[PDB]
């Protein structure tokens, strides 16, 4: 992965968006 703003943070954001969506 590219650590764009630290990949972990992007993954967290994604995961939270999924948490809201699902």
Swiss-Prot record:
It comes from Homo sapiens (Human). It comes from the Eukaryota. The chain holds residues 26 to 47 of 115 of the full protein. This is Motilin.
